Swiss-Prot record:
O2 binds at H65. One of its GO terms (cellular component) is extracellular exosome. It comes from Physeter macrocephalus (Sperm whale). This is Myoglobin. It comes from the Eukaryota. Monomeric heme protein which primary function is to store oxygen and facilitate its diffusion within muscle tissues. Reversibly binds oxygen through a pentacoordinated heme iron and enables its timely and efficient release as needed during periods of heightened demand. Depending on the oxidative conditions of tissues and cells, and in addition to its ability to bind oxygen, it also has a nitrite reductase activity whereby it regulates the production of bioactive nitric oxide. Keywords: Cytoplasm, Heme, Iron, Metal-binding, Muscle protein, Oxidoreductase, Oxygen transport, Phosphoprotein, Transport. SUPFAM superfamilies: Globin-like. It holds the Pfam family Globin. Residues 2-148 form the Globin domain. Its EC number is 1.7.-.-, 1.11.1.-. Belongs to the globin family. The modification Phosphoserine is found at S4. The modification Phosphothreonine is found at T68.
Length: 154
């Protein structure tokens, strides 16, 4: 798939808002993922023992993780589709060290879209959400192809 420049502009315009508070958005997204799909919390060995949302909000380790996820995703989105180099190390560690099925990447995509919709309603109307969904679908498709080359396809 290929996004048009106008679709990339819609994605990078909300993303510029997210970047005003990377840690806050990282927390919101990972908490929305873990509450919605608790099975995903089990993959994180540093924070899989957290039992409530209040504990999640207070966890410094979860907040650092969130910043790591969003910073790596933001670098991929700014490439506007030319992300081959960035995707290699990410696909290798998530397929052979962490073992993250593609399904879980769908779940976090859903959490990203939920949080942007709640926090940025004016910059995340239907056309901007469709463009972000296309950008995350592109990311998932390219990672799934790399998973396959690596021998995992999860
Ligand atoms: C937007 C998608 C994602 C991005 C951009 C992302 C990026 C990262 C980055 C940059 C790291 C640290 C470097 C590395 O290990 O590769 C990381 C670590 C990790 N990721 Fe992801 N990730 C994504 C989705 C996920 C999902 C959906 C899960 C699990 C349900 C996951 C589980 C992990 C785990 C278990 C680690 C190691 C955490 C620790 O240090 O103990 N990742 N991820």
């Amino acid at each position: 798939m290929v996004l048009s420049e106008g679709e990339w502009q819609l994605v990078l315009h909300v993303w510029a808002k997210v970047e005003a508070d990377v840690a806050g958005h990282g927390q919101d997204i990972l908490i929305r993922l873990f509450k919605s799909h608790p099975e995903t919390l089990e993959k994180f060995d540093r924070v899989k023992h957290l039992k409530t949302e209040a504990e999640m909000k207070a966890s410094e380790d979860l907040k650092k993780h969130g910043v790591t996820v969003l910073t790596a995703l933001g670098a991929i989105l700014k490439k506007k589709g030319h992300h081959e180099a960035e995707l290699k190390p990410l696909a290798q560690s998530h397929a052979t060290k962490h073992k993250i099925p593609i399904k879980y990447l769908e779940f976090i995509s859903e959490a990203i879209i939920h949080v942007l919709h709640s926090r940025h309603p004016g910059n995340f109307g239907a056309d901007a959400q469709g463009a972000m969904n296309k950008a995350l679908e592109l990311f998932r498709k390219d990672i799934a192809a790399k998973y396959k080359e690596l021998g995992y396809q999860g």
